[PDB]
CSV table of C-alpha atoms and ligand atoms in Angstrom, one decimal:
chain,number,residue,atom,x,y,z
A,26,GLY,CA,0.0,0.0,0.0
A,27,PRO,CA,1.0,3.7,0.4
A,28,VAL,CA,4.3,4.6,2.2
A,29,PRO,CA,3.7,6.3,5.6
A,30,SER,CA,4.5,10.0,6.2
A,31,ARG,CA,4.7,12.4,9.2
A,32,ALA,CA,5.1,16.2,9.6
A,33,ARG,CA,8.7,17.6,9.7
A,34,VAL,CA,7.8,20.1,12.5
A,35,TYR,CA,5.5,19.9,15.6
A,36,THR,CA,5.2,16.1,14.9
A,37,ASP,CA,4.5,15.0,18.5
A,38,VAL,CA,2.8,18.1,20.1
A,39,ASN,CA,-0.5,16.3,20.6
A,40,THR,CA,1.1,13.0,21.7
A,41,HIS,CA,2.8,14.7,24.6
A,42,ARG,CA,-0.4,16.5,25.8
A,43,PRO,CA,-3.2,15.1,27.9
A,44,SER,CA,-6.4,13.7,26.4
A,45,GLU,CA,-8.2,16.8,27.6
A,46,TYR,CA,-6.4,18.8,24.9
A,47,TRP,CA,-7.3,16.9,21.7
A,48,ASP,CA,-10.3,14.7,22.8
A,49,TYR,CA,-13.0,17.0,21.6
A,50,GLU,CA,-15.7,14.4,21.9
A,51,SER,CA,-15.2,14.5,25.7
A,52,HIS,CA,-15.1,18.3,25.9
A,53,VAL,CA,-17.9,19.9,28.0
A,54,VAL,CA,-19.5,22.8,26.3
A,55,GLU,CA,-21.1,25.6,28.4
A,56,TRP,CA,-23.7,28.0,26.8
A,57,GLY,CA,-23.9,31.8,27.4
A,58,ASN,CA,-27.0,33.9,27.1
A,59,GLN,CA,-28.4,34.3,23.6
A,60,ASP,CA,-30.3,37.4,24.9
A,61,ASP,CA,-27.0,39.3,25.3
A,62,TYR,CA,-26.9,39.6,21.5
A,63,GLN,CA,-29.1,41.3,18.9
A,64,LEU,CA,-28.6,40.3,15.3
A,65,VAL,CA,-27.9,43.2,12.9
A,66,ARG,CA,-27.4,41.8,9.3
A,67,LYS,CA,-26.4,38.7,7.4
A,68,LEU,CA,-22.7,38.7,6.4
A,69,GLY,CA,-22.7,35.4,4.5
A,70,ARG,CA,-23.9,31.8,4.1
A,71,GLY,CA,-21.8,28.7,4.3
A,72,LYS,CA,-22.4,25.0,3.6
A,73,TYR,CA,-23.5,24.3,7.2
A,74,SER,CA,-23.5,27.9,8.8
A,75,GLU,CA,-25.1,31.4,8.6
A,76,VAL,CA,-22.9,34.3,9.7
A,77,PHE,CA,-24.3,37.6,11.1
A,78,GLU,CA,-23.1,40.9,12.4
A,79,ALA,CA,-24.5,41.5,15.9
A,80,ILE,CA,-24.4,43.8,18.9
A,81,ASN,CA,-23.6,42.6,22.4
A,82,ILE,CA,-26.3,44.7,24.3
A,83,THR,CA,-24.4,44.4,27.6
A,84,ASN,CA,-21.4,46.5,26.4
A,85,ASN,CA,-22.7,48.0,23.1
A,86,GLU,CA,-19.8,46.2,21.2
A,87,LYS,CA,-20.1,44.7,17.7
A,88,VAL,CA,-19.6,40.9,17.4
A,89,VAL,CA,-19.9,38.2,14.8
A,90,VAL,CA,-22.4,35.4,15.3
A,91,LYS,CA,-21.9,32.1,13.4
A,92,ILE,CA,-25.2,30.1,13.5
A,93,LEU,CA,-24.4,26.4,12.8
A,94,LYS,CA,-26.9,23.9,11.2
A,95,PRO,CA,-26.4,21.1,13.7
A,96,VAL,CA,-25.7,18.5,10.9
A,97,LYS,CA,-23.0,16.6,12.9
A,98,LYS,CA,-22.6,17.2,16.7
A,99,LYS,CA,-19.0,15.7,16.6
A,100,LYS,CA,-17.9,18.5,14.1
A,101,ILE,CA,-19.4,21.3,16.2
A,102,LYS,CA,-17.5,19.9,19.3
A,103,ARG,CA,-14.3,19.7,17.2
A,104,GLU,CA,-14.5,23.4,16.1
A,105,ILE,CA,-15.5,24.6,19.6
A,106,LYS,CA,-12.5,22.8,21.2
A,107,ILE,CA,-10.0,24.0,18.5
A,108,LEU,CA,-11.3,27.6,18.8
A,109,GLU,CA,-10.9,27.4,22.6
A,110,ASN,CA,-7.4,25.9,22.3
A,111,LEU,CA,-6.3,28.6,19.8
A,112,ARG,CA,-8.0,31.6,21.6
A,113,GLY,CA,-5.7,34.6,21.8
A,114,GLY,CA,-3.2,33.2,19.3
A,115,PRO,CA,-1.7,35.8,16.8
A,116,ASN,CA,-4.2,36.7,14.0
A,117,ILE,CA,-6.6,33.8,15.0
A,118,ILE,CA,-10.3,34.8,15.2
A,119,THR,CA,-11.3,35.1,18.9
A,120,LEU,CA,-14.2,33.0,20.1
A,121,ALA,CA,-15.9,35.2,22.8
A,122,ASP,CA,-19.1,33.1,23.6
A,123,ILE,CA,-21.1,30.0,22.7
A,124,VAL,CA,-24.9,30.3,22.8
A,125,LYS,CA,-28.0,28.3,21.9
A,126,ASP,CA,-31.5,29.1,20.6
A,127,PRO,CA,-33.8,27.0,22.8
A,128,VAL,CA,-36.8,27.3,20.4
A,129,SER,CA,-35.1,26.1,17.2
A,130,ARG,CA,-32.5,24.0,19.1
A,131,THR,CA,-29.6,25.7,17.3
A,132,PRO,CA,-25.9,26.4,18.4
A,133,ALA,CA,-24.1,29.6,17.7
A,134,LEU,CA,-20.6,30.7,18.1
A,135,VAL,CA,-19.8,34.4,19.0
A,136,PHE,CA,-16.6,36.0,17.8
A,137,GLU,CA,-14.8,39.3,18.1
A,138,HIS,CA,-15.9,41.5,15.2
A,139,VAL,CA,-13.6,42.1,12.2
A,140,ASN,CA,-14.1,45.0,9.9
A,141,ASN,CA,-13.5,43.2,6.6
A,142,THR,CA,-12.5,45.3,3.5
A,143,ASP,CA,-13.7,44.1,0.0
A,144,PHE,CA,-11.6,41.3,-1.7
A,145,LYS,CA,-12.5,42.5,-5.3
A,146,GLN,CA,-11.8,46.2,-4.5
A,147,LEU,CA,-8.5,45.4,-2.6
A,148,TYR,CA,-7.2,43.2,-5.5
A,149,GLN,CA,-6.2,46.4,-7.6
A,150,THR,CA,-5.1,49.0,-4.9
A,151,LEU,CA,-2.7,46.5,-3.1
A,152,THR,CA,1.1,47.1,-3.6
A,153,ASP,CA,4.1,44.6,-3.5
A,154,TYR,CA,4.6,45.7,0.2
A,155,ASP,CA,1.0,45.1,1.2
A,156,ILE,CA,1.2,41.5,-0.2
A,157,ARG,CA,4.4,40.8,1.8
A,158,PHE,CA,2.9,42.3,4.9
A,159,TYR,CA,-0.4,40.4,4.9
A,160,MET,CA,1.3,37.1,3.8
A,161,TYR,CA,3.5,37.4,6.9
A,162,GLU,CA,0.4,38.0,9.1
A,163,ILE,CA,-1.2,34.7,7.7
A,164,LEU,CA,2.1,32.8,8.4
A,165,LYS,CA,2.0,34.1,12.1
A,166,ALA,CA,-1.5,32.5,12.4
A,167,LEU,CA,-0.4,29.2,10.7
A,168,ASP,CA,2.9,28.8,12.6
A,169,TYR,CA,0.9,29.3,15.8
A,170,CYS,CA,-2.0,26.8,15.0
A,171,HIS,CA,0.5,24.2,13.7
A,172,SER,CA,2.6,24.6,17.0
A,173,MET,CA,-0.7,24.0,18.8
A,174,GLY,CA,-1.0,20.7,16.9
A,175,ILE,CA,-3.8,22.0,14.6
A,176,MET,CA,-4.1,21.9,10.8
A,177,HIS,CA,-6.7,24.5,9.4
A,178,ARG,CA,-7.4,22.5,6.2
A,179,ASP,CA,-9.4,25.4,4.6
A,180,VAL,CA,-7.0,28.2,3.9
A,181,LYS,CA,-8.5,30.4,1.1
A,182,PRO,CA,-9.2,34.2,0.6
A,183,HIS,CA,-12.7,33.9,1.9
A,184,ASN,CA,-11.3,32.5,5.2
A,185,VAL,CA,-9.0,35.5,5.6
A,186,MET,CA,-10.6,38.7,7.1
A,187,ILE,CA,-8.6,42.0,6.6
A,188,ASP,CA,-9.4,45.4,8.2
A,189,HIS,CA,-7.1,47.3,5.9
A,190,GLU,CA,-7.5,50.7,7.7
A,191,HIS,CA,-6.1,49.2,10.9
A,192,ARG,CA,-3.8,46.6,9.0
A,193,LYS,CA,-5.5,43.8,11.1
A,194,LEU,CA,-5.8,40.3,9.7
A,195,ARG,CA,-7.7,37.3,11.1
A,196,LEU,CA,-7.7,33.6,9.9
A,197,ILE,CA,-11.4,32.4,10.3
A,198,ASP,CA,-13.7,29.4,9.8
A,199,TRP,CA,-12.1,26.6,11.8
A,200,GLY,CA,-15.0,24.2,11.0
A,201,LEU,CA,-12.7,21.9,8.9
A,202,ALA,CA,-9.7,22.2,11.2
A,203,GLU,CA,-8.3,19.0,12.9
A,204,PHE,CA,-5.8,17.9,15.5
A,205,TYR,CA,-2.7,16.5,13.9
A,206,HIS,CA,-1.7,12.9,15.1
A,207,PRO,CA,1.4,11.4,13.4
A,208,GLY,CA,0.4,8.4,11.2
A,209,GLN,CA,-3.4,9.2,11.3
A,210,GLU,CA,-5.3,8.8,7.9
A,211,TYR,CA,-7.5,11.8,7.4
A,212,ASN,CA,-10.5,12.4,5.1
A,213,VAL,CA,-9.3,14.0,1.8
A,214,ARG,CA,-12.7,15.8,1.3
A,215,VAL,CA,-11.4,19.0,2.9
A,216,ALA,CA,-10.5,22.6,1.6
A,217,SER,CA,-12.0,24.3,-1.4
A,218,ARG,CA,-11.3,22.8,-4.9
A,219,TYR,CA,-8.8,25.5,-6.1
A,220,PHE,CA,-6.8,25.3,-2.8
A,221,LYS,CA,-6.6,21.5,-2.5
A,222,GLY,CA,-3.1,20.2,-2.3
A,223,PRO,CA,-2.0,17.3,-4.6
A,224,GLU,CA,-2.1,14.9,-1.5
A,225,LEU,CA,-5.9,15.4,-1.4
A,226,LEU,CA,-6.4,15.0,-5.2
A,227,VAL,CA,-4.4,11.7,-5.4
A,228,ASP,CA,-6.2,10.4,-2.2
A,229,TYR,CA,-3.1,10.3,0.0
A,230,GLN,CA,-4.7,10.2,3.5
A,231,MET,CA,-1.6,10.6,5.8
A,232,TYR,CA,-1.2,14.4,5.2
A,233,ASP,CA,-0.2,17.1,7.8
A,234,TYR,CA,0.2,20.9,8.4
A,235,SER,CA,2.0,21.1,5.0
A,236,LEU,CA,-1.4,21.0,3.3
A,237,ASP,CA,-2.0,24.6,4.7
A,238,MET,CA,1.3,25.6,3.0
A,239,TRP,CA,0.1,24.5,-0.4
A,240,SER,CA,-3.2,26.4,0.0
A,241,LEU,CA,-1.2,29.6,1.1
A,242,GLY,CA,1.0,29.2,-2.1
A,243,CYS,CA,-2.2,29.1,-4.3
A,244,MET,CA,-3.2,32.4,-2.6
A,245,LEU,CA,0.2,34.0,-3.1
A,246,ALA,CA,0.3,33.0,-6.8
A,247,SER,CA,-3.2,34.4,-7.4
A,248,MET,CA,-2.2,37.7,-5.7
A,249,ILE,CA,1.2,38.4,-7.3
A,250,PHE,CA,0.0,37.2,-10.8
A,251,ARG,CA,-3.6,38.7,-10.5
A,252,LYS,CA,-5.1,35.4,-11.7
A,253,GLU,CA,-8.0,34.2,-9.6
A,254,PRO,CA,-8.0,31.3,-9.0
A,255,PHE,CA,-4.4,30.3,-9.9
A,256,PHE,CA,-5.3,26.6,-10.5
A,257,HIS,CA,-8.7,26.7,-12.1
A,258,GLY,CA,-10.0,23.1,-11.9
A,259,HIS,CA,-13.6,22.3,-12.9
A,260,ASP,CA,-13.8,19.2,-10.7
A,261,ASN,CA,-11.4,17.4,-8.3
A,262,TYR,CA,-9.8,15.3,-11.1
A,263,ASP,CA,-9.4,18.3,-13.4
A,264,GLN,CA,-7.9,20.2,-10.5
A,265,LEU,CA,-4.7,17.9,-10.5
A,266,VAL,CA,-4.5,18.4,-14.3
A,267,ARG,CA,-4.4,22.2,-13.8
A,268,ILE,CA,-1.5,21.8,-11.3
A,269,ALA,CA,0.3,19.4,-13.7
A,270,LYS,CA,0.0,22.0,-16.5
A,271,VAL,CA,2.2,24.3,-14.3
A,272,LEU,CA,4.4,21.9,-12.3
A,273,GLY,CA,4.8,19.3,-15.1
A,274,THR,CA,3.9,15.6,-15.1
A,275,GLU,CA,7.5,14.4,-14.4
A,276,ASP,CA,7.6,15.7,-10.8
A,277,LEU,CA,4.0,14.3,-10.4
A,278,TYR,CA,5.2,10.7,-11.1
A,279,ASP,CA,8.2,11.2,-8.8
A,280,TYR,CA,5.8,12.3,-6.0
A,281,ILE,CA,3.4,9.3,-6.4
A,282,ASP,CA,6.4,6.9,-6.8
A,283,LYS,CA,8.0,8.2,-3.6
A,284,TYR,CA,4.9,7.4,-1.5
A,285,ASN,CA,3.7,4.4,-3.6
A,286,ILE,CA,0.4,6.1,-4.4
A,287,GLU,CA,-2.1,4.4,-6.7
A,288,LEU,CA,-3.5,7.0,-9.2
A,289,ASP,CA,-7.2,6.7,-9.7
A,290,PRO,CA,-8.1,5.4,-13.2
A,291,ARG,CA,-10.1,8.6,-13.8
A,292,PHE,CA,-6.7,10.3,-14.4
A,293,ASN,CA,-5.7,8.0,-17.2
A,294,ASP,CA,-7.3,9.9,-20.1
A,295,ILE,CA,-7.1,13.5,-18.7
A,296,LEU,CA,-3.6,13.9,-17.2
A,297,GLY,CA,-1.6,13.9,-20.5
A,298,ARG,CA,2.1,15.0,-20.6
A,299,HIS,CA,3.2,18.4,-19.4
A,300,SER,CA,6.5,20.2,-19.2
A,301,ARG,CA,7.6,22.0,-16.0
A,302,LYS,CA,6.8,25.7,-16.5
A,303,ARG,CA,9.1,28.6,-15.4
A,304,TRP,CA,7.3,31.0,-12.8
A,305,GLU,CA,8.4,34.0,-15.0
A,306,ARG,CA,5.9,32.8,-17.7
A,307,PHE,CA,3.0,34.1,-15.6
A,308,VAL,CA,4.4,37.7,-15.4
A,309,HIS,CA,2.4,40.2,-17.5
A,310,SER,CA,2.0,44.0,-17.7
A,311,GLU,CA,-1.0,43.9,-15.3
A,312,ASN,CA,1.0,42.1,-12.5
A,313,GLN,CA,4.8,42.9,-13.0
A,314,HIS,CA,4.7,45.6,-10.2
A,315,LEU,CA,3.9,42.7,-7.7
A,316,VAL,CA,6.4,40.2,-8.9
A,317,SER,CA,10.1,39.9,-8.0
A,318,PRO,CA,12.8,37.2,-8.0
A,319,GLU,CA,12.3,36.8,-4.2
A,320,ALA,CA,8.5,36.3,-4.6
A,321,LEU,CA,9.1,33.7,-7.4
A,322,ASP,CA,11.7,31.8,-5.3
A,323,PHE,CA,9.3,31.8,-2.3
A,324,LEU,CA,6.4,30.6,-4.4
A,325,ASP,CA,8.5,27.9,-6.0
A,326,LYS,CA,9.3,26.6,-2.4
A,327,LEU,CA,5.6,26.5,-1.5
A,328,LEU,CA,4.0,25.0,-4.6
A,329,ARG,CA,5.7,21.6,-4.6
A,330,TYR,CA,3.9,18.2,-5.1
A,331,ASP,CA,6.0,16.7,-2.3
A,332,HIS,CA,4.2,17.9,0.9
A,333,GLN,CA,7.5,17.1,2.8
A,334,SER,CA,9.6,19.3,0.5
A,335,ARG,CA,7.4,22.5,1.1
A,336,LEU,CA,8.6,25.2,3.5
A,337,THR,CA,7.0,25.0,7.0
A,338,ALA,CA,5.4,28.3,8.2
A,339,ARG,CA,8.5,29.1,10.3
A,340,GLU,CA,10.9,28.5,7.4
A,341,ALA,CA,8.6,30.6,5.2
A,342,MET,CA,8.8,33.5,7.8
A,343,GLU,CA,12.7,33.4,7.4
A,344,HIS,CA,12.6,33.7,3.5
A,345,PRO,CA,14.2,36.8,1.8
A,346,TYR,CA,10.7,37.8,0.5
A,347,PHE,CA,9.8,39.0,4.1
A,348,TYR,CA,13.1,41.0,4.7
A,349,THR,CA,11.1,44.3,4.2
A,350,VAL,CA,8.4,43.5,6.8
A,351,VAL,CA,8.3,43.8,10.7
B,401,54P,O1,-15.1,38.6,2.7
B,401,54P,C1,-14.3,37.4,2.9
B,401,54P,C2,-12.9,37.8,3.3
B,401,54P,C3,-12.0,38.0,2.1
B,401,54P,N1,-10.6,38.5,2.5
B,401,54P,C4,-10.0,39.3,1.5
B,401,54P,C5,-8.6,39.1,1.2
B,401,54P,C6,-7.8,40.1,0.8
B,401,54P,C7,-6.4,39.9,0.6
B,401,54P,C8,-5.8,38.7,0.8
B,401,54P,C9,-4.4,38.5,0.5
B,401,54P,C10,-3.9,37.3,0.0
B,401,54P,C11,-2.5,37.1,-0.3
B,401,54P,C12,-1.6,38.1,0.1
B,401,54P,C13,-2.1,39.3,0.6
B,401,54P,C14,-3.5,39.5,0.9
B,401,54P,C15,-6.7,37.6,1.3
B,401,54P,CL1,-6.0,36.1,1.6
B,401,54P,C16,-8.0,37.9,1.5
């Protein structure tokens, strides 16, 4: 079968901690008062959640209320435990309260409010410096959650809130996050299609924190090249073909050979043969002010088939691309 793998960093953080820490199924949840909060407006709608702007009527402070469709109790417990574990970490959304609606029997998570600036409006006003600054802020959040034995598994622009006026960034939506246990085989049906790492697409279940580093690389490539998304798959099989059109099919076979992965027969007639492209090929007149040899070098070290060969969040923070930031 497939060759086993483990993370290169923070490998045994959960193994050396008591059960209390990672055993979310045994975690005791305590509700606050739903009447402390008045809902203002709908902010968004997710697969299993509805997000609202609200007012905490006891202190007149704005909050964010994430109402969960209680589809799977185990998943709600997991997110609550993870949020509690990460509470106060750099650039991590702060869980402030957990409440329930007794009439509809519905749980809700209460967060610190984040004054998010528009993604489609930011995309053109941002400078080379701004990209470096916010990428470093996301890395602070990932290095922290990885050090806490947690993989986010859903890194994408929609899960990154930015209050540009105050240069404040928060990594949100911890509903797909999971505790990392070396040797564990995880469900590959995580992340959003465009941000899925090759390990997910070839159904390699023994993945780790490095998955988040692929997803971050997809975000960086889309920002510096002004191409959203960078890898535009139309389905999960086509997604690997879009990556192969950039990274080449040679390094893809080296990857699957290294881990003795069995490629699904659905890849037989669509994968084709593709040469390894130079990152310089994606530079155009519309994006050249955001591209530099340091950015390309950094990107090349993130977007690698081999999850083990990708930079960790800490190594990424030490890259020359971030020499200009504090
Ligand atoms: O409304 C949903 C939240 C959408 N957030 C907008 C947003 C704006 C900029 C970035 C970004 C990405 C790479 C480098 C620098 C900045 C991200 Cl990840 C997200």
